[PDB]
Amino acid sequence: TDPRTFTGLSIVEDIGDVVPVTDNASPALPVSLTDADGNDVVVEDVSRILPLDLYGTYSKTIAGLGLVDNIVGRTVSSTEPALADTEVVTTGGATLNAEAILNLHPTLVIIDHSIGPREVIDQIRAAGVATVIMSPQRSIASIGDDIRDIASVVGLPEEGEKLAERSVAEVEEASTVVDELTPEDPLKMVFLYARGTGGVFFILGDAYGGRDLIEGLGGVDMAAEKGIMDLAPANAEALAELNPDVFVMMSEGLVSTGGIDGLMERPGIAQTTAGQNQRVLALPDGQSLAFGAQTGELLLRASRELYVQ
Ligand code: HEM
């Protein structure tokens, strides 16, 4: 079949919890490290972990390593089922709440600058909480190295190596399937971020890592073609210039703008090729840009929806 003739929404269902590599993780502590901001940190107690980021990666990797039961709080992006009853420590999108964090009496915060404010991260450290700043590479090629970095922090290097190798094998196997499914002329895609029916409506660029998802699905990321390094408002002019064949979206984000019907009301959407085919690939919000352990499964499920009728 010709995937340019497909129409309508394709939605990937929740992939669920990460399968841990062990049921008896025994952290080798203490650990001393210099983090991505240059802070020297001693990690001596991992009993109460806050693994916080915009993308939902760290909570999933921590579970993959065998420490899911140690997670005591989360951001909204960590939507995996195991954490559904775990306290949320952000407000709005991803704004850190110092009071909520400190009231959970964490022993370790793993975080990066995808969320903030920076000043709240500094307050938590000053209050006596061991805080480790990561700067993950967030590419498909670096899935294993990003896992190994997290594993080092919690004193689980062997589990890290197992999880890294398993995840890299899964993502290379998925890529074999993707390559067989892709059309000769790649589909043009964008990652369209939506939250609500108002102005939170953006084409995501380099900083958010959607290019590696789109290219992992065999597509061309029109944001990369046009040099978008952070994000651009998805206004009519931008949409006409990018003119994708498929909008890649987050499932709950799409619901929040009124589903396909609401999306089609937004200026410029209906005039693109994707809009004329009402062609949206919706991915679970908390997996879509998480990469990490589940990347291979995500690529497999998404490529089936893109290329198999
Ligand atoms: C790129 C990765 C991002 C991910 C994975 C992500 C994920 C999420 C998730 C899971 C929620 C909670 C949705 C709900 O429970 O209703 C949320 C809410 C939100 N996001 Fe994002 N988001 C991202 C980027 C952004 C960006 C770039 C902005 C703004 C520039 C933004 C603004 C918001 C806002 C305002 C909310 C609050 C919506 C509400 O009132 O419930 N997000 N996001």
Author numbering: 48 to 356
What does the paper say about this structure?
HmuTUV forms an ABC-type heme transporter system, in which HmuT, HmuU, and HmuV are the heme binding lipoprotein, permease, and ATPase, respectively. His141 and Tyr240 are coordinated to the heme as the axial ligands and Arg242 forms a hydrogen bond with Tyr240 in CgHmuT. As CgHmuT is a substrate (heme) binding protein that shuttles heme to the cognate ABC-type heme transporter CgHmuUV in Corynebacteria, the regulation of heme binding and release is very important for its physiological function.
The purified heme-bound proteins were crystallized, and the crystal structures of H141A-, Y240A-, and R242A-CgHmuT were determined in the holo-form at the resolution of 1.30, 1.65, and 1.30 Å, respectively. The distance between the oxygen atom of the OH group in Tyr240 and iron was 2.0 Å, which was identical to that for wild-type CgHmuT. The side chains of Tyr240 and Arg242 were entirely superimposable between wild-type and H141A mutants. On the other hand, the conformation of the loop composed from Gly139 to Ala141 was slightly perturbed by the mutation of His141 to Ala, while other parts were almost superimposable between them. The distance between the water and the iron was 2.6 Å. The ν2 and ν3 bands at 1583 and 1487 cm−1, respectively, are due to a five-coordinate high spin heme, while those at 1571 and 1480 cm−1 are due to a six-coordinate high spin heme.
